[PDB]
Point group: D2
Chain length 123, copies 4
Amino acid sequence: RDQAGITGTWYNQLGSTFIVTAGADGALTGTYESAVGNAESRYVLTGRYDSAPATDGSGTALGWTVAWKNNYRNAHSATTWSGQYVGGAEARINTQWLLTRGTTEANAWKSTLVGHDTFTKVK
Amino acid sequence: RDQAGITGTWYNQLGSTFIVTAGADGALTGTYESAVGNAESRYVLTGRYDSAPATDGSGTALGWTVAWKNNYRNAHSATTWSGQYVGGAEARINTQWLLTRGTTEANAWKSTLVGHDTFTKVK
Amino acid sequence: RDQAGITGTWYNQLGSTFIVTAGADGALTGTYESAVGNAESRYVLTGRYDSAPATDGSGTALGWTVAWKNNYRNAHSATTWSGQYVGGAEARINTQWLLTRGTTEANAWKSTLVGHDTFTKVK
Amino acid sequence: RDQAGITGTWYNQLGSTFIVTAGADGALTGTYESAVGNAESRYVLTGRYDSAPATDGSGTALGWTVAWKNNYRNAHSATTWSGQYVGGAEARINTQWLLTRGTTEANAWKSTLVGHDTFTKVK
């Protein structure tokens, strides 16, 4: 339903760039570029979305992962964004995210950051 | 480094089954079967992991997504697990997860569940 | 430093009302009224804030708890807001929150909702 | 119902010490000592719990806050624990927590850590 809705270039409140293709099978594939956190250039992302969402005005559930390793840098970390795509005049992806850093057992308690990103089709 | 470490069948504290292959390129591919939450049978998952982790005793950062749609059911939801793989005698994947349900704007505030799953190679 | 900054009436993006007094000792005391989630009227809250924040332009760390029981209703739940107070022209409290419902062991996995509320001094 | 159940000394998986009194009015008051994160000695905590929980075998919802300032140190941060008290043979408090550090706007995205602590009456 939202394959075309989701496919494209999205920007969050930080100036990060999320380039995604939604597959007819529920796949999400693309690249993430973070404006913050010592990331450089594009990182692979993959994820999933609900390819057959409720017809009742509900958002479309989705998430995706970026491991912060590319040819430029390795943060030894990974972020997952869990959220929903909201169609219409000003389409949004509203997300919450978990970033886990690889740590020792002794630092495991502080391994994970949590936040929220809102993505729009205009910067 | 942990491609073989991660590839395989993992079980969490709920009796859920996570079947994953780690690609040399950082890919995670496989299937998830939840013991809870009105899921039935296998659901596609995709994700990423740090294919070149720190050599310093740190875990390996990873995450993955499941959209809760297969041929049996559609929960109109998606879970992301963010965590780290810890190698050795009793290998673990320690995760935190966000489950977002597709909702109306009026219910968006209650769209997202958070928990923690610990995966082991024995049930 | 921010005792006066924090003391007052705040509104979030949902139209909820947070009435708080910051004590010189780091205490937060007051009442919360939720615009959503079948809450009615005021609920007691308590919390803490950093009464001696960094002088470097950083926010002031704080959190507080509401148990969703008053003389009108009992949701058998509790929310904690963790965030920071940002002073200046448009003062904000930026929070992330965890709502845990009392559950059986069998439903514990779905006990906890997560979100984010941003509070302003104007509605 | 669980006033006596909750009142006491609890330990988490990190060796931290949570000393709490549950008030008949839903209050939680006491002190927290963290085994990790450069905390030293006791810090004030306050919170709330459901003083009239469901009679149906459900846990009792609660949370509390610690601002990481005492006479010894100031981390410029605050943790909230949201969870539920589970009575019986081996009483537990199962929590999820958010730690927000005071930050600049530019670092706000990385302000918040998330984890999970399980508290028992024996160390």
